[PDB]
Each structure stands twice: as structure tokens, then as C-alpha cells.
Design an enzyme around this catalytic site. Structure first.
Site, PDB file in Angstrom:
ATOM      1  N   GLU A  35     -12.001 -14.080  43.459  1.00 46.54           N
ATOM      2  CA  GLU A  35     -10.879 -13.938  42.538  1.00 46.54           C
ATOM      3  C   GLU A  35     -10.059 -12.675  42.768  1.00 46.54           C
ATOM      4  O   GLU A  35      -8.838 -12.738  42.818  1.00 46.54           O
ATOM      5  CB  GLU A  35     -11.333 -13.933  41.073  1.00 46.54           C
ATOM      6  CG  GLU A  35     -11.718 -15.279  40.482  1.00 46.54           C
ATOM      7  CD  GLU A  35     -10.571 -16.290  40.401  1.00 46.54           C
ATOM      8  OE1 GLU A  35      -9.418 -15.948  40.741  1.00 46.54           O
ATOM      9  OE2 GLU A  35     -10.831 -17.441  39.982  1.00 46.54           O
ATOM     10  N   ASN A  46       2.211 -16.003  37.883  1.00 48.49           N
ATOM     11  CA  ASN A  46       2.406 -17.411  38.219  1.00 48.49           C
ATOM     12  C   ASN A  46       3.817 -17.763  37.778  1.00 48.49           C
ATOM     13  O   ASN A  46       4.061 -18.032  36.606  1.00 48.49           O
ATOM     14  CB  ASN A  46       1.375 -18.276  37.483  1.00 48.49           C
ATOM     15  CG  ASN A  46      -0.071 -17.851  37.787  1.00 48.49           C
ATOM     16  OD1 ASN A  46      -0.536 -17.963  38.920  1.00 48.49           O
ATOM     17  ND2 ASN A  46      -0.767 -17.339  36.779  1.00 48.49           N
ATOM     18  N   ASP A  49       4.496 -21.237  35.667  1.00 48.21           N
ATOM     19  CA  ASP A  49       4.319 -21.365  34.223  1.00 48.21           C
ATOM     20  C   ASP A  49       4.451 -20.060  33.454  1.00 48.21           C
ATOM     21  O   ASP A  49       4.053 -19.983  32.296  1.00 48.21           O
ATOM     22  CB  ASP A  49       2.995 -22.059  33.888  1.00 48.21           C
ATOM     23  CG  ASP A  49       1.807 -21.113  33.872  1.00 48.21           C
ATOM     24  OD1 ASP A  49       1.749 -20.194  34.708  1.00 48.21           O
ATOM     25  OD2 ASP A  49       0.928 -21.291  33.006  1.00 48.21           O
ATOM     26  N   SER A  51       2.783 -17.312  33.478  1.00 44.65           N
ATOM     27  CA  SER A  51       1.552 -16.659  33.019  1.00 44.65           C
ATOM     28  C   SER A  51       1.097 -15.662  34.092  1.00 44.65           C
ATOM     29  O   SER A  51       1.594 -15.684  35.218  1.00 44.65           O
ATOM     30  CB  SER A  51       0.439 -17.687  32.744  1.00 44.65           C
ATOM     31  OG  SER A  51      -0.064 -18.269  33.948  1.00 44.65           O
ATOM     32  N   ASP A  53      -2.570 -13.658  35.732  1.00 40.56           N
ATOM     33  CA  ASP A  53      -4.036 -13.583  35.817  1.00 40.56           C
ATOM     34  C   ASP A  53      -4.391 -12.090  35.873  1.00 40.56           C
ATOM     35  O   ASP A  53      -3.851 -11.363  36.704  1.00 40.56           O
ATOM     36  CB  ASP A  53      -4.512 -14.258  37.101  1.00 40.56           C
ATOM     37  CG  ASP A  53      -4.041 -15.688  37.216  1.00 40.56           C
ATOM     38  OD1 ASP A  53      -4.147 -16.427  36.231  1.00 40.56           O
ATOM     39  OD2 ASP A  53      -3.569 -16.075  38.293  1.00 40.56           O
ATOM     40  N   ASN A  60      -6.512 -15.764  32.921  1.00 36.67           N
ATOM     41  CA  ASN A  60      -5.117 -16.115  32.635  1.00 36.67           C
ATOM     42  C   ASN A  60      -4.584 -15.863  31.211  1.00 36.67           C
ATOM     43  O   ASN A  60      -5.257 -16.138  30.219  1.00 36.67           O
ATOM     44  CB  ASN A  60      -4.909 -17.577  33.038  1.00 36.67           C
ATOM     45  CG  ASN A  60      -3.459 -17.985  33.000  1.00 36.67           C
ATOM     46  OD1 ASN A  60      -3.004 -18.609  32.042  1.00 36.67           O
ATOM     47  ND2 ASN A  60      -2.721 -17.625  34.041  1.00 36.67           N
TER      48      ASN A  60
END
Length: 130
Positions: A35, A46, A49, A51, A53, A60
Site C-alpha cells: 500500500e 483519486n 471520485d 477521494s 487514500d 480512503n
């Protein structure tokens, strides 16, 4: 902070991650590794959308933490996403545990499905004293 392998394995163990909801420490290590490369300040926006992380587990903003800028988002871990960017990973661990209490468990992270599921993850904790 960028954790060294065994340093992180022991840190997670102390925080109660070993076998949490049936998830082994090596699975958590494989997740953090893929990750963020064990980097607590890792972030990924992102554009699709809107958002982001956050942290060592790349949790998220749409469902887990609040950053104030993600449309119609919720905050299931009840934390500021900033709490997921600390060198100290306690809050990130509490949130990661919250994520797994849901139906999918460790499968919530697509990276775990891609790089850890049905893989030999023994290597992640070998020699760490865990």
C-alpha cells in the site's frame, strides 16, 4: 516516517494486530508494504471520485476518515484523515481494525487481494521476533 520491516512488525504486534479478526501479522505487513512501502505520510488522490487514500494502510476518505473535501463522504473511524499521517501508527491501526470489522475483512483492500491473498507471505515477518 518510513518503517523498516521488522521494526514495523513488532510495532503492529504491540498494537494488537497479530491475529486480529483472524488476520495474521504477515498479512498486515504485506498490506502495508504494497500500500505505501511502510510510509506513514503516503497519500494518493483519486481524481475519478475526488477521494484521497492516507497513510501506511492507504485508508480512503470516502468512508473512513474526514478530510472535509470529499463529496458525500462519511467518517467511520471517526478521525481526521490527518490522524492517518502521523509517525505514530496507533490511530491508523485502530482505523484499519475498524475497516476489517466489516463483511469483507482484510479483502477491503484491493491491494491485499492483488499482492497478498493466496501468496506466501511468511517472508514479511521472518526474523523479526514476532
Amino acid at each position: 516516517k518510513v518503517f523498516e520491516r521488522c521494526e514495523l512488525a513488532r510495532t503492529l504486534k504491540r498494537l494488537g494486530m497479530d491475529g486480529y479478526r483472524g488476520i495474521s501479522l504477515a498479512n498486515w505487513m504485506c498490506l502495508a508494504k504494497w500500500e505505501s512501502g511502510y510510509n506513514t505520510r503516503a497519500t494518493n488522490y483519486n481524481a475519478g471520485d475526488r477521494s484521497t487514500d492516507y497513510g501506511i494502510f492507504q485508508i480512503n476518505s470516502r468512508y473512513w476518515c474526514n478530510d472535509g473535501k470529499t463529496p458525500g463522504a462519511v467518517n467511520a473511524c471517526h478521525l481526521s484523515c490527518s490522524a492517518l499521517l502521523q509517525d505514530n501508527i496507533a490511530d491508523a491501526v485502530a482505523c484499519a481494525k475498524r475497516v476489517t470489522r466489516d463483511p469483507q475483512g482484510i479483502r477491503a483492500w484491493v491491494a491485499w487481494r492483488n499482492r497478498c491473498q493466496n501468496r506466501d507471505v511468511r517472508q514479511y515477518v521472518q526474523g523479526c521476533g514476532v
